[PDB]
Design a protein around this ligand. Structure first.
Ligand SMILES: O=C(O)c1ccc2cc1OCCOCCNc1ccn3ncc-2c3n1
Ligand code: NA
Ligand code: NA
Length: 358
């Protein structure tokens, strides 16, 4: 401790952007001691703290800028994290646990129990070599379990992506791959938690038009047809593909190209979704407008193949993963598999009793 807790907690000022001026060794609430930097953003900063009222246990503390639009968004996030904590008092459903929140001189602060690396960071540090199928299976099972509980409590996350899924502990072992003739990092424990509820929407609330990060965004969002819980199911199917291959299913940044890639990989969009959309400019006599011969057309033709073509092995457990991913990636959100149904899919017969029982 370079600093004393009472003195440090009262010595306070903001910068011109409305960030809290702070550094390692500072205190908040005479309770939280800053020991590391974890992230910065337009919203504020994230620091690692020791919680001196709970045995110096480690927390991630979000410190939101002293700016009204960020303060208000944080207040809405806190109200969602409160409703989740209230419905899962014993944390069986694998959501990040908000341990505390407070207003620090205009800065909204949100504490979470400290976890390991996110699932994107781990993949990146493994040179984008994919997770082995048993790890994909256990992670898929935890995602279905976590989001089924939110969905059955009238909530949709809307922004599921590998960066928002955190390992409880990301320590790995280094195994040598016979087939790759080169070494792979294998996480020792595949237990995960779902983070980032700042976009989560209840059934009765106003639904923003464009939700989810591009790669994880479903066709009903792109076509502006309305969205609900099935939006999260599509995102999970994209995430599973990415854990299994190490690259994104939809490598695009434009709506028309994205819908074309969905057709190349998944088959035709249902005609009723095309009929209903305002985005008629994407279509001609009911078909997507697309030049197969342009530079983008040649890229998509070479790179975007039917989903089953991406299987790495053709044993039944690989067939079962691909069947479940195809059901998560149904175009029509009303026919898309629900997470209550996904938990009964035969893919999950391959779990160990320990993985199944949590
Ligand atoms: O928004 C949430 O719900 C959220 C929940 C938990 C954590 C962070 C969060 O958001 C801030 C992300 O930026 C910091 C990234 N690094 C780390 C590192 C270790 N942990 N352990 C928990 C979190 C964490 N974040
Ligand atoms: Na201070
Ligand atoms: Na909802």
């Amino acid at each position: 401790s370079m600093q004393s807790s009472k003195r440090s907690s009262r010595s306070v000022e903001d910068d011109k952007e409305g960030h809290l001026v702070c550094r390692i060794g500072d205190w908040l609430q005479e309770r939280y001691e800053i020991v590391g930097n974890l992230g910065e953003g337009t919203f504020g900063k994230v620091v690692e703290c020791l919680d001196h009222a709970r045995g110096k246990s480690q927390v991630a503390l979000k410190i939101i800028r002293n700016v009204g639009k960020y303060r208000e968004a944080a207040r809405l996030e806190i109200n969602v994290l409160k409703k989740i904590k209230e419905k899962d008092k014993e944390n069986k459903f694998l959501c990040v646990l908000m341990s505390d929140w407070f207003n620090f001189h205009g800065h909204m602060c949100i504490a979470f129990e400290l976890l390991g690396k996110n699932t994107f960071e781990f993949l990146k540090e493994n040179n984008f070599q994919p997770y082995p199928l048993p790890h994909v299976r256990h992670m898929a099972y935890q995602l279905c379990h976590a989001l089924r509980f939110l969905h059955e409590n009238q909530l949709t996350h809307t922004d599921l992506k590998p960066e928002n899924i955190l390992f409880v502990n990301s320590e790995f072992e280094t195994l040598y791959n016979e087939h790759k003739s080169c070494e792979e990092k294998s996480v020792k424990n595949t237990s995960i938690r779902v983070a980032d509820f700042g976009s989560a929407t209840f059934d009765h609330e106003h639904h923003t038009t464009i939700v989810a990060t591009r790669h994880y965004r479903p066709p009903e969002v792109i076509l502006e047809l309305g969205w609900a819980q099935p939006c999260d199911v599509w995102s999970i199917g994209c995430i599973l593909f990415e854990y299994y291959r190490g690259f994104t299913l939809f490598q695009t940044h434009e709506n028309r190209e994205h819908l074309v890639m969905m057709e190349k990989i998944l088959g035709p969009i249902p005609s009723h979704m095309i009929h209903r959309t305002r985005k008629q400019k994407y279509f001609y006599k009911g078909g997507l407008v697309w030049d197969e011969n342009s530079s983008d057309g040649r890229y998509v033709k070479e790179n975007c193949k039917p989903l089953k073509s991406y299987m790495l092995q053709d044993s039944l457990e690989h067939v079962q993963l691909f069947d479940l991913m195809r059901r998560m990636l149904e175009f029509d959100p009303a026919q898309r598999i629900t997470l209550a149904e996904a938990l009964l899919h035969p893919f999950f017969a391959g779990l160990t009793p320990e993985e199944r029982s949590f």
